[PDB]
Write a protein that binds this ligand. Structure first.
Ligand SMILES: OC[C@H]1O[C@H](O[C@H]2[C@H](O)[C@@H](O)[C@@H](O[C@H]3[C@H](O)[C@@H](O)[C@@H](O[C@H]4[C@H](O)[C@@H](O)[C@@H](O[C@H]5[C@H](O)[C@@H](O)[C@@H](O[C@H]6[C@H](O)[C@@H](O)[C@@H](O)O[C@@H]6CO)O[C@@H]5CO)O[C@@H]4CO)O[C@@H]3CO)O[C@@H]2CO)[C@H](O)[C@@H](O)[C@@H]1O
Ligand SMILES: OC[C@H]1O[C@H](O[C@H]2[C@H](O)[C@@H](O)[C@@H](O[C@H]3[C@H](O)[C@@H](O)[C@@H](O[C@H]4[C@H](O)[C@@H](O)[C@@H](O[C@H]5[C@H](O)[C@@H](O)[C@@H](O)O[C@@H]5CO)O[C@@H]4CO)O[C@@H]3CO)O[C@@H]2CO)[C@H](O)[C@@H](O)[C@@H]1O
Length: 476
């Protein structure tokens, strides 16, 4: 009697490339590529487990541009420059970026504390500021290789900074290939999402938000987004085919977001399985175990993730010692194993790149110990998405209707419903009536709405500039 454990690590970045200047206005794709996007599937070279990955097509597009050397990244240009050539604005952005990340354990360099307590920075201090920002984002693979430079902690030279930069781009150049390799070798399945990570249920039917928040105000959706929702899925299939050589049969719905109409669209586009959140299961069916494979109207398979286990990794274990955390996780899995007489399927699904920066040493002690311990428990079998879809010795159930929602409180309020987020939908609705190209699809990404209408925070004005630029470019 095994416990079937399925990790599904979701990787995504919205499009940071401004269409009039061609510049990447934030560096987050670069930094998560060098820190997480190669390294997370690279664990499979050292550990004999299965791990699965979602790659959004807009993320793939950007990884390709960085690998090809065509991304003009304005933040990275300020890192690369000799400090004598830095503009004041570039120094301010570098300071602000450091202050944003200052308390994360991956920024735990004593020299960073020294630099942020200086009234004025000279050339050698700016070089350290540049290089330590780079090295803070070092991934597991190069943390071994650059150990000498990482332990120095200070007094970096321009030659050393450039050496780090070169190694980082080598990692990026190898990134799509490792996903293809682990897929071909049967070490994991790779899924994708509708192209720019939109909220498919709202595009199909904005009235679905009322199934969970009846009091919400939404704008007048005077134009149909139903064909765009189809296009997000179809273009994603095409990009996935280019990279991996088949049409994707698994997709991760952005924000775990589903609805009856969205599940029908996924089915019509040939998707055979997806996962969503336990809250939607609880919202939709009174008696429902999350350890079964569900069939929605016998059209498409659905798994509901184990929210507790996913949130332990996403929110709890960064504050723990690595062995405390792994013992706790294994203990919980054992309690599941002993709590039922069938073989449960346990889906652990969360973002694959956003939690590690809060862990000691980028979560490498935690993941190395977790994966080492998992692979040695005879009662746990980690599965690919393909194996979880096809496994016969699993329990199964039919469901006929779900209540539309997301993994954020089961509802859509993080993307719609207040004055500021509604104004973005209004801009998009008016833009859609006049849209001439696929930049309207870029503007439909969920990320723009997530950041809008929150309390002010550094750099979020850039998301607004991007969104509004895509909206304008869509009409030309
Ligand atoms: O603000 C202070 C904050 O600091 C830390 O949080 C940071 C976190 O450690 C880091 O991983 C990242 O979080 C990312 C995350 O990695 C992504 O996967 C993504 O999270 C989504 C998540 O996977 C989904 O399950 C869903 O999360 C829901 C939960 O299911 C709800 O239970 C609720 O979670 C709260 C949880 O119950 C509490 O124990 C507490 O830890 O706080 C949790 C969040 O408030 O709400 C969330 C939805 O917010 O949806 C997620 C969003 O798509 O995205 C995350 C970032 O949004 O960044 C965190 C900094 O924001 C520390 O862990 C926290 O305890 C602390 O409160
Ligand atoms: O009120 C302020 C706010 O403060 C804190 O947030 C700040 C972060 O700590 C800080 O790092 C920075 O956040 C950056 C982030 O680091 C950067 O990577 C980028 O985020 C990307 C994700 O990396 C990417 O995966 C994708 O995330 C999706 C994800 O795929 C999806 O599944 C789901 O989880 O939604 C995510 C959002 O759509 O896209 C985002 C970009 O959209 O950009 C971030 C912003 O620059 O800045 C934060 C704000 O200052 C606390 O986290 C927070 O709770 C407080 O609300």
């Amino acid at each position: 009697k095994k416990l079937f454990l399925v990790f599904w690590w979701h990787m995504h970045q919205p499009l940071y490339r401004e269409p009039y200047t061609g510049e990447y206005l934030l560096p987050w794709t670069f930094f998560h590529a060098v820190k997480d996007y190669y390294d997370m599937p690279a664990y499979l070279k050292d550990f004999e487990i299965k791990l699965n990955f979602n790659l959004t097509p807009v993320l793939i597009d950007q990884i390709q541009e960085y690998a090809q050397g065509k991304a003009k990244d304005v933040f990275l240009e300020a890192i690369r420059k000799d400090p004598d050539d830095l503009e004041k604005e570039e120094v301010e952005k570098l300071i602000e970026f450091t202050k944003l990340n200052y308390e994360k354990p991956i920024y735990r360099f004593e020299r960073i504390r020294e630099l942020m307590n200086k009234e004025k920075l000279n050339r050698e201090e700016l070089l350290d500021l540049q290089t330590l920002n780079l090295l803070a984002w070092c991934g597991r693979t190069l943390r071994k290789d650059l150990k000498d430079l990482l332990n120095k902690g200070r007094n970096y030279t321009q030659e050393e900074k450039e050496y780090v930069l070169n190694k980082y781009f080598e990692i990026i150049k190898k990134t799509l290939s490792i996903y293809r390799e682990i897929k071909e070798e049967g070490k994991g399945s790779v899924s994708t999402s509708p192209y720019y990570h939109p909220l498919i249920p709202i595009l199909l039917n904005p009235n679905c938000v009322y199934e969970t928040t009846p009091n919400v105000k939404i704008p007048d959706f005077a134009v149909s987004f139903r064909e765009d929702a189809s296009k997000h899925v179809e273009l994603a299939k095409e990009k996935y085919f280019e990279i991996f050589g088949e049409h994707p049969v698994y997709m991760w719905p952005p924000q775990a977001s589903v609805s009856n109409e969205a599940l029908e669209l996924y089915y019509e586009k040939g998707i055979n399985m997806l996962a969503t959140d336990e809250v939607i299961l609880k919202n939709s069916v009174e008696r429902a175990s999350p350890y079964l494979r569900y069939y929605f109207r016998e059209l498409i398979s659905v798994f509901f993730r184990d929210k507790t286990l996913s949130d332990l990794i996403g929110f709890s274990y960064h504050a723990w010692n690595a062995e405390d955390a792994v013992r706790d996780f294994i203990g919980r899995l054992k309690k599941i194993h002993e709590s039922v007489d069938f073989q449960p399927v346990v889906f652990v699904v969360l973002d694959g790149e956003n939690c590690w920066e809060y862990y000691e040493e980028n979560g490498i002690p935690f993941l190395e110990k977790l994966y080492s311990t998992l692979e040695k428990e005879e009662w746990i079998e980690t599965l690919t998405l393909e194996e979880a879809m096809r496994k016969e010795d699993v329990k199964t159930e039919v469901i006929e209707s779900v209540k539309a929602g997301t993994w954020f409180d089961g509802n859509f309020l993080k993307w719609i419903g207040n004055k500021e987020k509604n104004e973005y939908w209004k801009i998009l609705i008016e833009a859609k009536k006049k849209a001439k190209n696929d930049y309207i699809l870029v503007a439909e990404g969920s990320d723009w709405f997530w950041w809008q209408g929150e309390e002010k925070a550094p750099f979020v004005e850039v998301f607004d500039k991007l969104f509004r630029s895509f909206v304008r470019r869509a009409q030309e």
